[PDB]
Amino acid sequence: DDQLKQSALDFHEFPVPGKIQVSPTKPLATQRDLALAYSPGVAAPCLEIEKDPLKAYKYTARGNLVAVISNGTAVLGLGNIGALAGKPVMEGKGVLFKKFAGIDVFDIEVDELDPDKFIEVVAALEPTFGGINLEDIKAPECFYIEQKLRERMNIPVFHDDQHGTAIISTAAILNGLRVVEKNISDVRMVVSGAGAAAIACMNLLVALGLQKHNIVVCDSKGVIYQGREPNMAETKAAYAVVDDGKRTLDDVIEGADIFLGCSGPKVLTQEMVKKMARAPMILALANPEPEILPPLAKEVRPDAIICTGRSDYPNQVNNVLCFPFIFRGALDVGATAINEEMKLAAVRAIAELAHAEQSEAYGDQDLSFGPEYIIPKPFDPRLIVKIAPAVAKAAMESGVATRPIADFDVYIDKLTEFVYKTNLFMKPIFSQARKAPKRVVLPEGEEARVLHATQELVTLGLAKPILIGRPNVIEMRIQKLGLQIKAGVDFEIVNNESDPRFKEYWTEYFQIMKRRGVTQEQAQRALISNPTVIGAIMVQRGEADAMICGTVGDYHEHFSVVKNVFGYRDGVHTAGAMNALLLPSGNTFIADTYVNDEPDAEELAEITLMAAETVRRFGIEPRVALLSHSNFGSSDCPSSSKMRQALELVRERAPELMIDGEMHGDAALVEAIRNDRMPDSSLKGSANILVMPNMEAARISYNLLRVSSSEGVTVGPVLMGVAKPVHVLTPIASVRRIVNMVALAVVEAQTQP
Amino acid sequence: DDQLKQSALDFHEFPVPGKIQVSPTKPLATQRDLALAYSPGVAAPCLEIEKDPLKAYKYTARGNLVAVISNGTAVLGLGNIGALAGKPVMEGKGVLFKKFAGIDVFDIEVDELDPDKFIEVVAALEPTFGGINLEDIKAPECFYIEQKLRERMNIPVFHDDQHGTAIISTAAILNGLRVVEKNISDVRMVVSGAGAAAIACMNLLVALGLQKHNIVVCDSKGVIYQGREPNMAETKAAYAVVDDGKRTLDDVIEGADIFLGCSGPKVLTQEMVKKMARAPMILALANPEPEILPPLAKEVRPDAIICTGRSDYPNQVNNVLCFPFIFRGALDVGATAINEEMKLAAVRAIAELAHAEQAYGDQDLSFGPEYIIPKPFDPRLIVKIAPAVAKAAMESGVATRPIADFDVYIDKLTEFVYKTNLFMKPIFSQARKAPKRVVLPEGEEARVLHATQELVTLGLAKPILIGRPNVIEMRIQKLGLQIKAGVDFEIVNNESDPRFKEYWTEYFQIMKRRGVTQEQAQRALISNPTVIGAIMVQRGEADAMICGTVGDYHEHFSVVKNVFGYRDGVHTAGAMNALLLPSGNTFIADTYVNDEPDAEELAEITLMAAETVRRFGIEPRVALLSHSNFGSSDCPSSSKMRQALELVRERAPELMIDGEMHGDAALVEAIRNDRMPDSSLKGSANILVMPNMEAARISYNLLRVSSSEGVTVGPVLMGVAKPVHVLTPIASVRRIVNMVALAVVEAQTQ
Ligand SMILES: [Mg+2]
């Protein structure tokens, strides 16, 4: 793409150059605080590391630090573009390391092409880092460098491209073998191209039972023929195929149970897939193009199982699926290196994650074990809970574990807390929108941000945009922005001034509002000036299915329009406004940020129920907490008494819901603070839904936190309780916020109308 | 020591090992956000660097990233201890880089001892960082390493221990020569100890006007004269003098205007100080012990100007004075290295900071014999030095990124200092200068006990604890605290005290018509500790009180308001909490006093909060928060805010404030400029007045968990006559110590 290619160039620059930053972890406010971080206090920690260098984890960041190193020789698929140009990728490793594994990571770019000299620099940096992740080092240098460094360095050395992708591919093979019911020793494996991971796949596969003679390796020149070259690379000589008269891939593909290979753009054809054995396993792992298109192989062989590196095709083999979770277990036991036994233990846990049953969505996915699901989702949360204990338990058995863990259950619980914090509810919602697009009206069609959103909604294919406004101003603005969206084709424009059904529309609005103080002469004025009214009428008739408005205008202008045309949903008598923020405590929400200035007891209860119902659908656990200036009966304020009555009310309508209150804000986010004021609290962990006692409390909180918590744009002001799928936005809402909200409306529009 | 050397070991251990962490700067909440960061969107910023390596600073962390590298051969005063053992010093280095100048730093510990492999490893790491910092490398290996690395690498390389110390020292001599009225060409300088900083300082001084024939150097063997040894070090040979028949320091110290010592302690004697020239400048920079102690030199010569490395003596020479700020100027213009023209303008920037003129800073910044080097924590350091570095680098021709306007540049620099101003440091220093008697009613509470130890050790206050003496002493032992009763602190037994009869009678006369009986007053003087300390402060037995660590806020506040009363001129009270937010130090009020303050009460709160922030040293930027944004909603809460704004402007026009506004408009200037271009408020406001307590309390709660890295000032009580503050049950020991320090400062001026 070019639309998404440019939004990343902007992302890597705004607001600050660079993605990662070194921040303090200990205070430094006072003058004594400086005398303990430096002179003369810092003398003591250094003198305890010369006494005992094993005590380095206690006083330094070495106990959770890994260096991603690269010379830029083969960055992803770009090639040798330079070590300096490869820095944004190495920073990406660290930011993914921190987001998922919580492992502080330094990006290191070494300007050395000589394999020996490069090895010296890395061995020199051993005391600095607790672990070394070798990244984007072209072949065959990587085989030599990684081998020498693991022996040389008493800290773990790992190659994510060579060994990491092998752990995923090996796990897929073992799982796929269980589905086709073929024993590993019997299957014959054929590998295309001199894949760096291919050598490690076989090694791991051999350690599990795969016969070497069954393995047939095919370099890009041809099949490996023993003796065709007197001088041969050690990786090619180790897996040597005796010359059997087979020169091409089409010669060895017949009678082959498994196909694999990093190298090769589109080496597999539809005719070669027919020639393969029963229920073939196809592992296509070339970044630009799969070895065979997965539908092309399914058409000739329905029993086949295909694995690609690309995310659109199922069974994604992502490097991000393992390499952070391996280092996490290794760093927690202080392993001297990552032995093959640990890597294998990771392969087991990854396959075990597919077998284990799913738990607890608006997005529609099935995780049942089958030909579509032989490897877990690329961003599955349970990865850390399973991979890290297995790596550490194997490391303690192997004897490289310097530091033991007394109880694995305590360690798992720490890992369990980290899982709760991170969730990606947005991605399944988007995919659900592609399955059944619905028409959505945007009343502010002439606004610049709406136009940018209209394109990205048309590009991803989420909904049918129906803009409102003077077409003349829209057409001009499109050409000034550089967009390729076509009126009457990509999106339907409705002019507020010229409309055939105009008389039909004002008669419906008048029949609704004749008694709410709207004359006929006013209603006709209304369907030309306020586009919110126009779209609102369209949804009730069926001309559209949802509406996203409020990108320019006071919230209550648009909300009063909605409230009158569609009315409350069934079984509701008050509406709610829920905003979201990405907090250290995880994804968190605020209740009634715009609707009711002073919500009463029963009104506050209905808001809570709708927010819980709406969060359940997102794929997030509803852990609700009512907030007040009172702490569990500190004050008898009428606003604090109202919160208490609401807790009792919700308990009778949805007793299964987890909620407690009232409490201070800190008590709802830190489980420790809550355990000292209330041990019996039904609330467990960080709460994600915060119901406010009044709007001022809400709007002051959402604002002050949006700036100082994080810039995670997820869902803006989510309106709840209205019978028709509608959401009203803030005027300062960014373009990314507009897109996300339109998708949310489509999934709500797929629901029973 | 054994307590300042044990508490240092606990400082690094908990709550998390280490002193730094890698933190994301970019959003990572949605799957698209992740895609833009790594595969595949990461390929776009990389392909732009394949076209031009200059686009790096624009798309990567370089230009704000510097590496502090060491081998472990000269770690402070410890010496060669290993590269691993020197890691905590390298973390503390870069953490000063960030806290003082905002320059992220990877510490790098190289496992090397041959200077050949060392230069290779570092030069290999050139593409990563925008600059290289060398620290704790033994001599003479450091000279050779730095020289080779500086020419080889086109990014700056700087030895902190030698060049940084030389820049400060050179500035000191220039200012001292103005004091003693001596031209630089005419003065004669003698140097003992061939330390790396001395050689560079002389080289720097020679470029500024100092004469080599006037300079005489003495190494351990003797006075460096030409032809003493056929094979001589190239650094030593540059300042060897014509043979004057003098081999001893005593022979050459005669008639000497400047003495600079990098050698061992006690090389200079009182007899040598007597025979120096008029008003000698003695730069006794030695650690851990100075060559000559300043008082012994002051006795023989009172007019002399002396500087050492230690902090307790005046005119302390500290590396933290320049080394963060030289790099900040070089990186903002992307200098290829650090040259002599910059190093001179740096000396010029530091010396010119002592002449210009200037309130919690008790230390008087008057240019004289005791002040020729600015203070270590001085705010204007980065504002002055970095522009001179960038300007002198642009004129020497090594900068790759021209700054068009130095005015906008200085503004960005000034905003960083005001945002990160450490108000706590000057407070603690003031508390050390004069301890005052402070009462802590919850004496049995462990956190209070822990806080008392830190107070005594630092010498902030003389504590008076109330409680059962049995339990306090028993808990002290269980905690392991070394404080002893009757000596470090006083205890007043609640159950039995000789002044009991006087206290309940004094309390009763204050509260007889407020619902307290004689019999009720007596029960209260044994059961409620907070009542006791209040009577003491009013009687004069104690100068201030810090309570509320246990109990609901309004119990302690009720007692306080009755006894102490409101200050003259104020009829309402307020509660302020402090947060170290990303936008800056931010205060919120009121959070515990008034549930629904009226307009006039809201205005007085604002005025008092302005006074308190001004006392801290931070400039007051005030914003009135409401759900309505500049009248978007007309309601009692919003109308109240607008009225208060007019009231505050009448009582004090100088105060910068605008309202009402949304929260985002107070923090993000961009949002406020769009909604109101004419807003008198500028930048990011630091004082947030609230419409009602319920919103303030729910804000501070959800914020103190969203900006966890700062623990500074707890609930500040504003308006009460006597120096009193009430805390929270969740108040950390950090918080109780800090608040007692605030209490002491307040009680000094009653
Ligand atoms: Mg790589």
Rg (CA), chain A: 30
Q: Please name the residues in contact with B500: beta carbons below 8 A apart, sequence gap of 6 or more.
A: B525, B526
B518-527: list long-range contacts, CB under 8 Å, 24+ apart.
Answer: B525/B494, B525/B500, B526/B494, B526/B495, B526/B500, B527/B494
Whole-number Å distance between alpha carbons of B382 and B488: 40
Chain A hits for B377, Cβ within 8 Å: 31
Whole-number Å distance between alpha carbons of B682 and B623: 10
Whole-number Å distance between alpha carbons of A256 and A191: 10
**Residue A749 token pair:** 């529009």
**Residue A657 token pair:** 């819901």
CA distance B27 to chain A (A): 6
Chain B hits for A50, Cβ within 8 Å: 81-82, 85
DSSP string of B84-140, one letter each residue:
TTTHHHHHHHHHHHHHHH--EEEEEE----SHHHHHHHHHHTTTT-S-EEE-S--TT
Chain A hits for B430, Cβ within 8 Å: none
Distances from the Cα of B502 to the Cα of A9, B441, B496, angstroms = 76, 19, 13
Nearest Cα to A215, choosing from A193, A183, A241? Answer: A241
Which chain B residue lies closest to A666 (C-alpha atoms)?
Answer: B701
Whole-number Å distance between alpha carbons of A540 and A544: 8
Q: Residue A430, SS3?
A: helix
Whole-number Å distance between alpha carbons of A710 and A704: 11
* Header resolution in angstroms: 3.8
Handedness of CA B559, B561, B562, B563 (dihedral sign): positive
For A347, other C-beta atoms within 10 Å of its C-beta total 27
Distance A76 CA to ligand 1 centre (A): 6
CB-closest option in A39, A47, A639 to B694: A639
Distances from the Cα of B461 to the Cα of A292, B1, B148, B473, angstroms = 78, 21, 53, 20
Spatial contact of A374 and A175, defined as CB atoms under 8 Å apart:
yes
E-state strands within B303-386 = 305-307
Q: Tell if the CB–CB gap between A597 and B24 is shorter than 8 Å.
A: no
CB-closest option in B28, B32, B83 to A99: B28
Whole-number Å distance between alpha carbons of A8 and B166: 45
Q: Please name the residues in contact with B593: beta carbons below 8 A apart, sequence gap of 6 or more.
A: B557, B572, B573, B574, B575, B693, B717
Dihedral angle computed from the Cα positions of residues A494, A495, A498 and A503, in that order, rounded to the nearest 10 degrees: 60
Spatial contact of B436 and B544, defined as CB atoms under 8 Å apart:
yes
A33-38: list long-range contacts, CB under 8 Å, 24+ apart.
Answer: A34/B96, A35/B4, A35/B311, A36/B4, A36/B7, A36/B8, A36/B11, A37/B11, A37/B19, A37/B92, A37/B95, A37/B96, A38/B89, A38/B92, A38/B93, A38/B96, A38/B320
Q: Residue A627, SS3?
A: strand
For A542, other C-beta atoms within 10 Å of its C-beta total 9
Beta bridge partners of B215: B189
Distance A162 CA to ligand 1 centre (A): 9
**Choice among A5, A19, A38, A411 that is catalytic:** A38
Residue B368, annotated as binding a ligand: no
Spatial contact of A619 and A696, defined as CB atoms under 8 Å apart:
no
Nearest Cα to B381, choosing from B307, B320, B338? Answer: B320
Chain A hits for B425, Cβ within 8 Å: 29-31
If 0-12 CB within 10 Å is exposed, 13-18 middle and 19+ buried, where does residue B650 land? exposed
For A501, other C-beta atoms within 10 Å of its C-beta total 14
Q: Tell if the CB–CB gap between B49 and A4 is shorter than 8 Å.
A: no
DSSP string of B413-472, one letter each residue:
HHHHHHHH--THHHHHHHHHHS--EEEES--SSHHHHHHHHHHHHHT--EEEEEE-HHHH
E-state strands within B233-314 = 258-261, 281-284, 305-307
**Residue B735 token pair:** 């918080």
CB-closest option in B46, B82, B87 to A78: B46
Q: Tell if the CB–CB gap between B30 and A426 is shorter than 8 Å.
A: yes
Q: Please name the residues in contact with B733: beta carbons below 8 A apart, sequence gap of 6 or more.
A: B447, B450, B451, B454
- Method used to determine the 3D structure: X-ray
CA distance B358 to chain A (A): 22
Q: How many CA atoms lie within 13 A of B577 on its CB side?
A: 26
Q: Tell if the CB–CB gap between A25 and B19 is shorter than 8 Å.
A: yes
Residue A92: what are its φ and ψ, rounded to 5°?
-65, -35
Torsion-angle region of residue B294: left (phi > 0), alpha (psi -120 to 50) or beta? alpha
What is the strand order of the sheet A157-159 is part of?
Answer: A104-109, A65-70, A131-134, A157-159
CA distance A270 to chain B (A): 29
Distances from the Cα of A446 to the Cα of A474, A486, B506, B674, angstroms = 5, 15, 75, 19
Residue A307 host element (H or E): strand A305-308
CA distance A5 to chain B (A): 6
Whole-number Å distance between alpha carbons of B222 and A462: 85
Distance A117 CA to ligand 1 centre (A): 20
Whole-number Å distance between alpha carbons of B494 and B540: 18
Spatial contact of B392 and B345, defined as CB atoms under 8 Å apart:
yes
- Which of A42, A69, A136, A557 is best to mutate for the B interface (most B CBs within 10 A)? A42
SS (H, E, C) A127-155: CCCCEEEECCCCCCHHHHHHHHHHHHCCC
Amino acid at A232: M
**Residue B291 token pair:** 């060559």
Residue B476 host element (H or E): helix B469-479
For B143, other C-beta atoms within 10 Å of its C-beta total 19
Task: Please provide the size of chain B in residues.
Answer: 750
Which chain B residue lies closest to A21 (C-alpha atoms)?
Answer: B23
Whole-number Å distance between alpha carbons of B306 and B370: 8
CA distance A703 to chain B (A): 5
Nearest Cα to A134, choosing from A299, A337, A291? Answer: A337
Residue B672: what are its φ and ψ, rounded to 5°?
-75, -35
Whole-number Å distance between alpha carbons of B411 and B407: 6
The CA-to-CA distance between both ends of chain B, in Å, stands at 36
Nearest Cα to B594, choosing from B608, B580, B578, B614? Answer: B608
Q: Tell if the CB–CB gap between A49 and B88 is shorter than 8 Å.
A: yes
Q: Residue A582, SS3?
A: strand
**Residue B416 token pair:** 């960083």
∠ CA B675-B677-B679, rounded to 5°: 95
Task: Please provide the size of chain A in residues.
Answer: 753
Nearest Cα to A133, choosing from A101, A155, A102, A166? Answer: A155
Residue B720: what are its φ and ψ, rounded to 5°?
-75, 145
Spatial contact of B204 and B344, defined as CB atoms under 8 Å apart:
yes
Give the number of A-B residue pairs with CB atoms closer than 8 Å. 476
**Residue A592 token pair:** 């009634």
- The pairing of beta strand B20-24 with beta strand A20-24: antiparallel
Whole-number Å distance between alpha carbons of A630 and A608: 19
Burial B335-357 (b: 16+ CB within 10 A, else e): bbbbbebbbbbbbbbbbbbbeee
Residue B389 host element (H or E): helix B381-396
Distance between alpha carbon B162 and the CA centroid of its chain, in Å?
Answer: 23
Distance A164 CA to ligand 1 centre (A): 10
**Residue A336 token pair:** 């001297």
**Residue B307 token pair:** 């500087």
Beta bridge partners of B66: B105
Residues of B known to be catalytic: 38, 93
Dihedral angle computed from the Cα positions of residues A94, A95, A101 and A107, in that order, rounded to the nearest 10 degrees: 10
Distance A160 CA to ligand 1 centre (A): 6
Nearest Cα to B320, choosing from A37, A44, A60, A23? Answer: A37
- The pairing of beta strand A189-192 with beta strand A216-218: parallel
CB-closest option in B63, B704, B712 to A17: B63
DSSP state of A98: I
**Residue A145 token pair:** 């460098």
Whole-number Å distance between alpha carbons of A338 and A326: 9
Q: What angle, 0 to 180 degrees and rounded to 10, lies between the N-to-C axes of helices B529-539 and B500-511?
A: 90
Q: Break chain A down into helix, strand, coil percent, rounded to 5.
A: 45, 15, 40
Q: Residue A295, SS3?
A: helix
Q: What angle, 0 to 180 degrees and rounded to 10, lies between the N-to-C axes of helices B500-511 and B518-527?
A: 120
Residue with tokens 């492992």: A103
Distance between alpha carbon A348 and the CA centroid of its chain, in Å?
Answer: 23
Spatial contact of A81 and B81, defined as CB atoms under 8 Å apart:
no
- The pairing of beta strand B584-589 with beta strand B574-581: antiparallel
CB-closest option in B11, B128, B734 to A108: B128
Q: Tell if the CB–CB gap between A629 and B697 is shorter than 8 Å.
A: yes
**Residue B2 token pair:** 């054994």
CA distance B563 to chain A (A): 24
Q: Please name the residues in contact with A364: beta carbons below 8 A apart, sequence gap of 6 or more.
A: A428, A432, A435
Spatial contact of A343 and A327, defined as CB atoms under 8 Å apart:
no
Whole-number Å distance between alpha carbons of A614 and A599: 20
SS (H, E, C) A496-557: CCCCCCHHHHHHHHHHHHCCCCCCHHHHHHHHHHCHHHHHHHHHHHCCCCEEEECCCCCHHH
Residue B701, annotated as binding a ligand: no
E-state strands within B503-602 = 544-547, 574-581, 584-589
Distance A318 CA to ligand 1 centre (A): 12
Amino acid at A153: M
Residue B726 host element (H or E): strand B724-726
Q: How many CA atoms lie within 13 A of B198 on its CB side?
A: 29
Distance A104 CA to ligand 1 centre (A): 18
Rg (CA), chain B: 30
**Residue A31 token pair:** 């003058």
Spatial contact of A36 and B431, defined as CB atoms under 8 Å apart:
no
Residue A638: what are its φ and ψ, rounded to 5°?
-55, -30
- Which of B114, B627, B669 is best to mutate for the A interface (most A CBs within 10 A)? B627
Alpha helices for A566-664 (secondary structure H): 601-618, 638-653
SS (H, E, C) B145-211: HHHHHHHHCCCCEEEHHHHHHHHHHHHHHHHHHHHHCCCCCCCCEEEECCCHHHHHHHHHHHHHCCC
Amino acid at A565: V
Spatial contact of B544 and B380, defined as CB atoms under 8 Å apart:
no
Which chain A residue lies closest to B591 (C-alpha atoms)?
Answer: A629
Residue B717 host element (H or E): strand B716-718
Residue B108: what are its φ and ψ, rounded to 5°?
-135, 120
Whole-number Å distance between alpha carbons of A368 and A358: 8
The CA-to-CA distance between both ends of chain A, in Å, stands at 35
Whole-number Å distance between alpha carbons of A182 and A315: 20
Dihedral angle computed from the Cα positions of residues B668, B672, B673 and B677, in that order, rounded to the nearest 10 degrees: -150
Q: Tell if the CB–CB gap between A17 and B64 is shorter than 8 Å.
A: yes
- The pairing of beta strand B621-625 with beta strand B656-661: parallel
Q: Tell if the CB–CB gap between B50 and A96 is shorter than 8 Å.
A: no
CB-closest option in A29, A583, A670 to B422: A29
Chain B hits for A83, Cβ within 8 Å: 127
Distance B79 CA to ligand 1 centre (A): 40
Nearest Cα to B385, choosing from B440, B447, B438, B343? Answer: B343
Spatial contact of A387 and A342, defined as CB atoms under 8 Å apart:
no
Whole-number Å distance between alpha carbons of A616 and B167: 63
